[PDB]
Amino acid sequence: SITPGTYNITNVAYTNRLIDLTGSNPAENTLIIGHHLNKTPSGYGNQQWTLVQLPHTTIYTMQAVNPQSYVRVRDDNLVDGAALVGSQQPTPVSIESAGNSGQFRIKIPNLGLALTLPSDANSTPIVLGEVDETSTNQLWAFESVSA
Amino acid sequence: SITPGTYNITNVAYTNRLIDLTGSNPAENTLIIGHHLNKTPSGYGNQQWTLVQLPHTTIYTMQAVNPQSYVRVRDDNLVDGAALVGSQQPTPVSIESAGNSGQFRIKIPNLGLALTLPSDANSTPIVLGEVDETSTNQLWAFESVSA
Ligand SMILES: CC(=O)N[C@H]1[C@H](OCCN=[N+]=[N-])O[C@H](CO)[C@@H](O[C@@H]2O[C@H](CO)[C@H](O)[C@H](O)[C@H]2NC(C)=O)[C@@H]1O
Numbered sequence: 244s245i246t247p248g249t250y251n252i253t254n255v256a257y258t259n260r261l262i263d264l265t266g267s268n269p270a271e272n273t274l275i276i277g278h279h280l281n282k283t284p285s286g287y288g289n290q291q292w293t294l295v296q297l298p299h300t301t302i303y304t305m306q307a308v309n310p311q312s313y314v315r316v317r318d319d320n321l322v323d324g325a326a327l328v329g330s331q332q333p334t335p336v337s338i339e340s341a342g343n344s345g346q347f348r349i350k351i352p353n354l355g356l357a358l359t360l361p362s363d364a365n366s367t368p369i370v371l372g373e374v375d376e377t378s379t380n381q382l383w384a385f386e387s388v389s390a
Numbered sequence: 391s392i393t394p395g396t397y398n399i400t401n402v403a404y405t406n407r408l409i410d411l412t413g414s415n416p417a418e419n420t421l422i423i424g425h426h427l428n429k430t431p432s433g434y435g436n437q438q439w440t441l442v443q444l445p446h447t448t449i450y451t452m453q454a455v456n457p458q459s460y461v462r463v464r465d466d467n468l469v470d471g472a473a474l475v476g477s478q479q480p481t482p483v484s485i486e487s488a489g490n491s492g493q494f495r496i497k498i499p500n501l502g503l504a505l506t507l508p509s510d511a512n513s514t515p516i517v518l519g520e521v522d523e524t525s526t527n528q529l530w531a532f533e534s535v536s537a
């Protein structure tokens with residue numbers, strides 16, 4: 244499973260879209276979106292995500308670098324279509340390798356829902372979607388931010 | 391939420407019953423059961439459970455002190471009535487205070503299911519049951535182990 248650490252996380256369908264906390268805004272419910280890289284080599288802090296892992300399981304918290312908002316399903320409403328947002332508290336996620344290259348699904352534990360990017364349009368908010376076998380938009384790649 | 395550490399866990403409905411790994415058996419799929427305290431004052435290692443926590447969540451792993459088997463739902467079959475067993479791999483659980491005091495429900499994350507002890511007979515296996523706020527069979531007291 245992915246080692247704890249700090250990553251740029253890019254969509255597999257839309258490889259030029261990173262997970263990005265809108266406007267580096269620390270406010271609750273700020274949306275999390277798919278957005279072009281906003282600074283080389285690894286973006287500002289709002290496109291870097293630190294993963295903390297529960298040993299011997301695939302459960303993690305994801306926290307941005309700056310501001311330090313965690314990834315959270317808005318209002319803890321774990322249903323299809325629900326928005327991902329920046330919050331002072333995280334939603335635990337299950338990050339699971341897809342049979343793939345170094346590709347992963349970021350899943351809501353035990354619900355069969357996953358983070359998806361529904362459009363390549365820049366700034367498209369990321370939402371939950373149903374886990375499936377053929378959609379690449381709920382597939383994600385992780386790249387370490389250089390120390 | 392509960393502080394990480396090593397605990398004896400006693401049922402609320404049946405106060406002479408602790409979560410216990412059958413016969414201190416290290417084998418996979420060994421039943422977890424309700425059973426009287428097997429040693430004073432904190433039982434042997436099969437009745438002592440170490441909790442590991444993912445910070446800022448209520449998700450945890452539970453592992454016996456000896457042998458070191460984790461608490462796992464049989465075949466990761468997260469449905470009503472499924473057996474709890476020891477395994478080399480854990481089922482992440484959500485340990486949530488049930489108001490009261492020192493009382494907690496050990497729930498399956500995001501599902502309406504929780505560990506429950508259906509009878510005070512010695513060695514009755516612990517199994518998942520639907521979450522039910524009024525049922526003491528799925529309530530648990532946690533006492534730090536002095537040993
Ligand atoms: C609404 C908003 O936050 N707009 C801009 C913000 O302007 C704030 C003032 N008024 N408005 N109205 O300015 C930031 C910083 O330039 C800007 O942030 C970018 O937002 C995009 C999505 O639109 C993406 O999140 C970028 O990564 C982000 N860049 C930074 C550095 O935060 C925001 O859109």
Ligand SMILES: CC(=O)N[C@H]1[C@H](OCCN=[N+]=[N-])O[C@H](CO)[C@@H](O[C@@H]2O[C@H](CO)[C@H](O)[C@H](O)[C@H]2NC(C)=O)[C@@H]1O
Binds near residue numbers: 428434513
């Ligand atoms: C038979 C065997 O291989 N193990 C038994 C063990 O046998 C001792 C030999 N016969 N004598 N006197 O005996 C213990 C009971 O003392 C037994 O372990 C207990 O099993 C129950 C449920 O069946 C429960 O898990 C108890 O906590 C457990 N106690 C300990 C200390 O492991 C074991 O199966």
